[PDB]
Amino acid sequence: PQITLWKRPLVSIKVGGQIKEALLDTGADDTVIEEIALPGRWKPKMIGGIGGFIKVRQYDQIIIEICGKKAIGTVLVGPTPVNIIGRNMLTQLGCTLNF
Amino acid sequence: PQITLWKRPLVSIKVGGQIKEALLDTGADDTVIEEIALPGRWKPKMIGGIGGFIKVRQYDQIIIEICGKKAIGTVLVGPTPVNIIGRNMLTQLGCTLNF
Ligand SMILES: CC(C)(C)NC(=O)[C@@H]1CN(Cc2cccnc2)CCN1C[C@@H](O)C[C@@H](Cc1ccccc1)C(=O)N[C@H]1c2ccccc2C[C@H]1O
Ligand SMILES: [Cl-]
Ligand SMILES: [Cl-]
Ligand code: NA
């Protein structure tokens, strides 16, 4: 499909057995989600954007459904203002910018 | 052009008579550039990132050029780690998300 940007590119996603709303974010290197329960062991990580850095937990090989597609990859969990689908996942979806 | 997301979608832009590197950011509502000299009056504004809010100067009716295409709109000037081209400008360039 083709998503215009006249409004926020928000989509429904399934992760951690839960349905959530997330932002398709080309400006994000990684994918970070609000506090949620994920399986397996995690490693610490610092991610920075406007306003500085935040500490998140990194879980790997996590399954995520986005726009009727499945992606399996790294998912960060922490105090992010909004759920963010970053490039690590967007590439799995075969997403590209066009203009 | 069609831009893949394996790496950050950086592009050269023309703004304030200067040439700069900026990131095509679908998750960004606004366009924010590091300290740069812009003409006209400005208004103060607070914008929030994953790390918190930063204070910026809001300029309106600013023209930017990207890959031969031009757009006019609001440009925020402040301490941003990276220059960001947001949706308010991406729409004007006819930039879409495709997969
Ligand atoms: C207008 C402004 C630019 C202030 N907007 C944002 O920062 C929004 C904020 N919302 C949230 C919000 C905050 C307050 C109010 N409403 C909404 C979440 C989504 N971001 C957009 C991000 O894509 C911005 C980038 C900027 C950046 C890129 C590369 C290097 C440094 C900074 C961003 O924060 N990306 C980072 C990022 C993001 C997620 C996971 C990993 C990483 C690493 C890094 O790529
Ligand atoms: Cl990944
Ligand atoms: Cl605008
Ligand atoms: Na990016």
Q: Where are the domains of chain B?
A: 1-99
What's the CA gap between B82 and B59, in Å, rounded?
18
The upper half-sphere exposure of residue B17, i.e. CA atoms within 13 Å in the direction of its Cβ, equals: 3
For residues A18 and A93, what is the distance between their CA atoms, to the nearest angstrom? Answer: 20
Give B10 Cα–ligand 4 centroid separation in angstroms: 8
Question: Tokens 């290197």 sit at which residue?
Answer: A29
Identify which of B26, B53, B82 has the shortest CB distance to residue A9: B26
Is B46 within 8 Å of B53 (Cβ atoms)?
yes
B92 DSSP 8-state letter: G
Name the structure determination technique.
Answer: X-ray
Q: Give A56's strand partners.
A: A45
Q: A1-99 belongs to which CATH class? A: mainly beta
Cβ A5–B97 below 8 Å, yes or no?
yes
Judge contact between B97 and A9, C-beta under 8 A.
Answer: yes
